[PDB]
């Protein structure tokens, strides 16, 4: 297996905690957030078969980032990833998205065709959702949370000179979907589409994990978050948080 690489998180990962309107205030919130200036892991897909799709822990929430030039990247979430338990499948088809919750039997290499080669059997289906697709080079960022019997997705998409490090700037992730599923999640995996040879590509992504922390957020007159500070980052920010 290829060695892992790390990159600085910078000021990324801030999302809207709740659904309440706040304008021209400063609010202190204790919630699950990505700590500032943390190290995140970086996954490559480089061409005795290649194993570039590991199975990773979910913990208490996941921050996912992709900088793909073309669309190679859906997801699988679950506990056992077999037929003994239920799993969540998200697939981004060319025209529509499909979200399903069933008992699946997933293959050893769940790849896609540029289609249903992800599972051999799917029984006991208890959820099904179809909607618009989630969609130069662009940076697409997602935050996945699983709390009180609800799966919450937050998304952001920003058009991009140097791609070596994640950009230094502030942007807030906006709510996308709140699925009312009731399953337990401890593992997750990513799906890659392989074009048939007459297969790899520039598929790189970043994964990070959230922690319980207290943040101070600034709201503007229109309800948009403009600045945020981490209380436990440094002694200088402690004075600002204490007030």
């Amino acid at each position: 297996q290829l060695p892992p690489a790390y990159t600085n998180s910078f000021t990324r990962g801030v999302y809207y905690p709740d659904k309440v309107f706040r304008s021209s205030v400063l609010h202190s919130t204790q919630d699950l957030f990505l700590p500032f200036f943390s190290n995140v892991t970086w996954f490559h897909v480089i061409s005795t078969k290649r194993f570039d799709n590991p199975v990773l822990p979910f913990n208490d929430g996941v921050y996912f980032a992709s900088i793909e030039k073309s669309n190679i990247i859906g997801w699988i979430f679950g506990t056992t990833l077999d037929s003994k338990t239920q799993s969540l499948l998200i697939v981004n088809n060319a025209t529509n998205v499909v979200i399903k919750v069933c008992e699946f039997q997933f293959c050893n290499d769940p790849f896609l065709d540029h289609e249903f080669r992800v599972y051999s059997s799917a029984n006991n289906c208890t959820f099904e959702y179809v909607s618009q697709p989630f969609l130069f080079k662009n940076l697409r960022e997602f935050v996945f949370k699983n709390i009180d019997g609800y799966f919450k997705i937050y998304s952001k998409h920003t058009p991009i000179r140097e791609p070596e490090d994640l950009p230094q700037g502030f942007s807030a992730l906006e709510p996308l979907v709140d699925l009312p599923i009731g399953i337990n999640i401890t593992r997750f995996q990513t799906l890659l589409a392989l074009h048939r040879s007459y297969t790899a590509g520039a598929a790189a992504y970043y994964v990070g994990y959230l922690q319980p922390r207290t943040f101070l957020l600034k709201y503007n007159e229109n309800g948009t978050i403009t600045d945020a500070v981490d209380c436990a980052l440094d002694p200088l920010s402690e004075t600002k948080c204490t007030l």
């Epitope: 659904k19 309440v20 309107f21 959702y129 709510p175 709140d178 007159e221 229109n222 948009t224």
Partner: nanobody, 120 residues
Framework: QVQLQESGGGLVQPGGSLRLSCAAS????????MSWYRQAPGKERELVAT????????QYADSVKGRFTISRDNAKNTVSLQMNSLKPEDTAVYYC?????????????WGQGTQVTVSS
Amino acid sequence: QVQLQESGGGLVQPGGSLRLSCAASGLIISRYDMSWYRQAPGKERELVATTPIPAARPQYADSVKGRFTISRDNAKNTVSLQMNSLKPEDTAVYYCNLGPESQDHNYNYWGQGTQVTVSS
């Protein structure tokens, strides 16, 4: 600088069909749970309709079931209510703002409003 303007209303015969539109400036609908409110002479204020975040269904009131439909156009910041048949005792003024779960303690804002009346 939040500003809400409601349009669509007036005098109609019983059991008509009306489309009320809400234009919001300074606010992004995609982030909040919006609602439709109503107040009547001597009736104080009572909730009418609610439209939660996607992957959830609308929740009406018990006495208004099966008579209104709601829509949410996020691209142009529009909330619309489509009116089915109604009893003549539904004449009132209708307001458009955030839902009960999207309001703080210090929120006192209400737009102009629209009048709807059923002529019997």
